[PDB]
């Protein structure tokens, strides 16, 4: 009745049975890079 | 002359005044940067 030839293993990104798939995946949102910097400080008590 | 006697007397009073003023300034400093409490220096306890 039906034949479904599908990829796997090293063919993960490949499907070979034409089902007419219109699937268009979205794009990964760019996350803001958050580098952490801890330089030394002179005392803010110098102000007082 | 009691005049210059009194003059130097309250001149010495002035000198003691300035030493007291500077001492209070230094002690308010010594209290501020120390976060001083009867428990101890800062938020810890010695």
Curated annotation (Swiss-Prot), chain A:
The record marks 13-14 as: Cleavage. It comes from the Eukaryota. N-glycosylated. It is found in: Cell membrane; Cytoplasm, Cytoskeleton; Nucleus, Nucleoplasm; Cell membrane, Sarcolemma. Residues 34-45 have a biased composition (Basic and acidic residues). Coiled coil: none annotated. It is a single-pass type I membrane protein. Residues 22-45 are annotated as: Disordered. Transmembrane protein that plays important roles in connecting the extracellular matrix to the cytoskeleton. Acts as a cell adhesion receptor in both muscle and non-muscle tissues. Receptor for both DMD and UTRN and, through these interactions, scaffolds axin to the cytoskeleton. Also functions in cell adhesion-mediated signaling and implicated in cell polarity. This is Beta-dystroglycan. It comes from Oryctolagus cuniculus. The chain holds residues 703 to 750 of 895 of the full protein.
């Amino acid at each position: 009745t039906s034949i479904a030839i599908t990829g796997s293993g090293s063919c993960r990104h490949l499907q070979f049975i034409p089902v007419a798939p219109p699937g268009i995946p979205s794009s990964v949102t760019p996350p803001t890079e958050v580098p952490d910097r801890d330089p030394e400080k002179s005392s803010e008590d110098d102000v007082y | 002359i009691y005049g210059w006697r009194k003059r130097c007397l309250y001149l010495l009073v002035l000198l003691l005044l300035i030493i007291l003023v500077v001492n209070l300034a230094l002690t308010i400093w010594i209290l501020k940067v120390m976060w001083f409490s009867p428990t101890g220096m800062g938020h810890l306890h010695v």
